[PDB]
Each structure stands twice: as structure tokens, then as C-alpha cells.
Ligand binder design. Sequence first.
Ligand SMILES: CCCCn1c(Cc2cc(OC)ccc2OC)nc2c(N)ncnc21
Length: 208
Amino acid sequence: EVETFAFQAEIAQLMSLIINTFYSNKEIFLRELISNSSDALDKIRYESLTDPSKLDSGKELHINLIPNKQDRTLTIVDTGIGMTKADLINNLGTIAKSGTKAFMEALQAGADISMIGQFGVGFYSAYLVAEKVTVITKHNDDEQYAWESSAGGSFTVRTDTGEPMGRGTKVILHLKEDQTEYLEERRIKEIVKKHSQFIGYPITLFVE
Ligand SMILES: CCCCn1c(Cc2cc(OC)ccc2OC)nc2c(N)ncnc21
């Protein structure tokens, strides 16, 4: 059973700006997602120091970038802390509301879309390049879920019956027709080198 939810008005407004503004520097989406994966990995690492059993769902702390020309998708996989149903439906939005208001204020005043990460809302930069985003995620305290949105004001959540991931998040970017450059090995390698070369976990770029 698939449940359908409305974004909060502020978040729907941020998603339209991101979709609608003319802004050519779209590649920054990838460092925003990688950064989000890095924070989640820091989190579970930290939490495991005082509860070693939090890694029973997998000891390896890493990021995989998987392009699939066939599906036209690029997936950012992490084995970080993961997200609960409450995160997905409620808490992330609650937190994102104020980072959105700050981000929006900054833009007038002459900030640009590439600073979105300073405001804790860089996830939504996914919509620079993706027509639809699917997030598969698994937290220790909870079940595996699939979140999805093509923007338009709503998202769905369902329990995910696919391949169990153990622990972590996969962000699956269904790319726009004109953005398949981000499926190319030399392009991804270029962007990681430029914006993500210091991340403190291994990032494996899968080949097609
Ligand atoms: C804002 C920071 C936490 C949420 N989060 C994020 C950002 C985020 C994810 C979303 O998924 C549907 C929605 C909104 C988000 O930011 C507000 N990425 C994560 C990740 N890879 N692993 C764990 N938590 C993550």
C-alpha cells in the first residue's frame, strides 16, 4: 500500500524554484548528496562507539555511485545511519522548513543555488538534474521504505519489498532527458575530484 503526502508549502516552493530557475551550474547536486551520505556515515560511526551492535546491519562505511544508462538513473548509495518512516513523512520536512526560509532569503541578497548546502536542504538539488527521485532507506530502528517524488507538490511512501539493504540510503536519480551526461564515467569522476575529493569514506564509481 502506497501512502501519498503533501509537501509543506515552503518545501514545495523550494522545489519549484530549483526546477524553474535558470541556473547552468547543475553538477553541484552530486556533492550535496555525497555530503549528505558523509554526515549519515559520521552519525552511525559515532553512535557505534557506544553501542557496537548498531553495526550488526553491516560494518562497512562507504559510498557507491552507480550509473545505469539503460534505466537512465544515477544512484548514490551509502551504508550510513538511514532514515525512519518519521524522518521521511515528518521530521525532515519540519527541519527543512527553516533551512528553506534562510536559503530563500539569501537568494535575494545575491546568494546562488550552489550555496543550498549551507542551509541543510541540499537534498532538493537532486531536482536540478532528476525528473523523479526515489529514496530507498533502511534505519536500524525500523523497516525498509521507498520514498518517491516527481515534485508537483507531493511525495509517496511505501514499505519497500525490493532487495534488503542491511542499513543505509540509496538515492536514485531518474535523470531528465537532457542530463544523461551524469551517466558518463569521465563526467562523474570529474565532479567527485572537483567537489568531493576529501570525503572521509571510500567512494566507488561503478562502471557500466
Ligand atoms: C537534512 C539531513 C538528514 C536527512 N538525510 C538526507 C537529506 C534529505 C533526505 C531526504 O530523503 C527523502 C529528504 C530531505 C532531506 O533533507 C532535508 N540524506 C540522508 C542520507 N543519505 N542518509 C541519512 N539521512 C539523510
